[PDB]
Ligand binder design. Structure first.
Ligand SMILES: Nc1ncnc2c1ncn2[C@@H]1O[C@H](COP(=O)(O)OP(=O)(O)O)[C@@H](O)[C@H]1O
Ligand SMILES: Nc1ncnc2c1ncn2[C@@H]1O[C@H](COP(=O)(O)OP(=O)(O)O)[C@@H](O)[C@H]1O
Ligand code: SF4
Ligand code: SF4
Ligand SMILES: [Mg+2]
Ligand SMILES: [Mg+2]
Lengths: 276, 276
């Protein structure tokens, strides 16, 4: 068996930093993991690969002819801890649907046997500002059973978490896609942990971990590494290890209860975020 | 004549706060303005209307039968300074293309004579995390000649500005859509103004204004107002007046020069943003 997980959230919230660091911690533990990049920014694997980024399936298929002229062993690349990495890519801005490459990539990986029995986890790193096209495909087509949403005390980040939750509810009549938890990626604001716990409770889930804001992240990423690899003794490395442990142990996977805009604003006022 | 402008940028960067405050300043000056909300969040007019939000064309058309059973005078609403306001709306998450309501809304407004000769400005407030579907329509279909991109020293916000610029370039062979400037909506980071000026120069545009981070924004918005209306004497009100004046006076409208990821990272290192 293997656990198929997706990390969603608004742009810039910390999906790729959190995913790569979480996965490095899982690999450090002895788990076998694949990361599938599902964001057109296409830098979701660079910290595992020590790289600028990774060439995408869409780019590689165009240079080869068709996606069928690609070989899996040419596409997947392994980095830190043996973690396997692939990027979907997507059309250029203004050209066609931004999510179209996700559909091509996931179907290619399934057809070509990338989901080998020895994997313990797959993580999709998915753009979450809109829930449509290929970005909704991991939910609509039952590819990721465990959705973890990275968010913060920012109103926009909580709105995104609510919208992703609505997408999960919409497709709950078939498949088994569920909300697994919220990950608070801190902005250093007062009562932010309490706020995201409260939001998680309203949605029916949990806040699986509070990730502190720590400049060691920037220092590791300048050097194209996870914190786990850059400084295994760092306080922040232990934070990612705690998140990984709780993901491994998590058994709460729910059909969430999306909330109203009024409820979101009440949360913000209650925990004095707008009044800090 | 009337100047058709669109405000683009990544989610949560400050599009709606900046647009409504800029437009309130224009109205305070004696200009006649319409705001067209092109973001599914659909709260792009609430500070002009003193409201929770505004019911959307998609919602109103569903309750009426077809969009053709709607009347313009039933749809457009006027608030502070006589500013006219409309929201496009969009399908729910997981259901169809998130941008589809923008196409319906803009076509309805054109057909029904909303672009009356007495308007001085129209501002579209457009989601910019993806440049496709209805979100690309103002560029692809020549609806907004002047694009202003709200951004910050955040890497993701600058990447979004670059992606929007690529969309402008893609459609430059017809129509007259141009990049008018970058608006820096500050994160209180050192050298942020210098960074966005440098990015603007690389793209071929200008940084039209540096908007400071100021808590008066939160206090005004809790009360459903622009800063212009909430406290006309506030320092931040004068900041929005300066931005409005420079928009009125701006004559630089370019086909931009998108940059590489390497150039973006160099900008970040040069101005010590990641090392603050
Ligand atoms: N916990 C953290 N502490 C400090 N910086 C962070 C943290 N998480 C993310 N960042 C920084 O935030 C920026 C955006 O994160 P990223 O994971 O790329 O966002 P996304 O993938 O959601 O667009 C990156 O520069 C990253 O280094
Ligand atoms: N200059 C500013 N100073 C302080 N807070 C701001 C400023 N600009 C925006 N904000 C706050 O940032 C949040 C997001 O802004 P908004 O305009 O809604 O973003 P967008 O429309 O781009 O998603 C809002 O809570 C807003 O009040
Ligand atoms: S939102 Fe992108 S194409 Fe539908
Ligand atoms: S990205 Fe939304 S539907 Fe194409
Ligand atoms: Mg990312
Ligand atoms: Mg907005």
């Amino acid at each position: 068996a293997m656990r198929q997980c997706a990390i969603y959230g608004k742009g810039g919230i910390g999906k790729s930093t959190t995913t790569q660091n979480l996965v490095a911690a899982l690999a450090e533990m002895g788990k076998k993991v694949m990361i599938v990049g599902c964001d057109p920014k296409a830098d979701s694997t660079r910290l595992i690969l020590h790289s600028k980024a990774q060439n995408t399936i869409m780019e590689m298929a165009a240079e080869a002819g068709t996606v069928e002229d690609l070989e899996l062993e040419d596409v997947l690349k392994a980095g830190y801890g043996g973690v396997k990495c692939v990027e979907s890519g997507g059309p250029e801005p203004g050209v066609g649907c931004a999510g179209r490459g996700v559909i091509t990539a996931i179907n290619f990986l399934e057809e070509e046997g990338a989901y080998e029995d020895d994997l313990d986890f797959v993580f999709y790193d998915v753009l979450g500002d809109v829930v449509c096209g290929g970005f909704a495909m991991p939910i609509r087509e039952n590819k990721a059973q465990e959705i973890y949403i990275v968010c913060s005390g920012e109103m926009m980040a909580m709105y995104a978490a609510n919208n992703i939750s609505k997408g999960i509810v919409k497709y709950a009549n078939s498949g088994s896609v569920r909300l697994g938890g919220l990950i608070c990626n801190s902005r250093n604001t007062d009562r932010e942990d309490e706020l995201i716990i409260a939001l998680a409770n309203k949605l029916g889930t949990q806040m699986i971990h509070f990730v502190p804001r720590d400049n060691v992240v920037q220092r590791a990423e300048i050097r194209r590494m996870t914190v786990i690899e850059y400084d295994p003794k760092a306080k922040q490395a232990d934070e990612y290890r705690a998140l990984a442990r709780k993901v491994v142990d998590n058994k709460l996977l729910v059909i969430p209860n999306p909330i109203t805009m009024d409820e979101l604003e009440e949360l913000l006022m209650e925990f004095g975020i707008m009044e800090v």
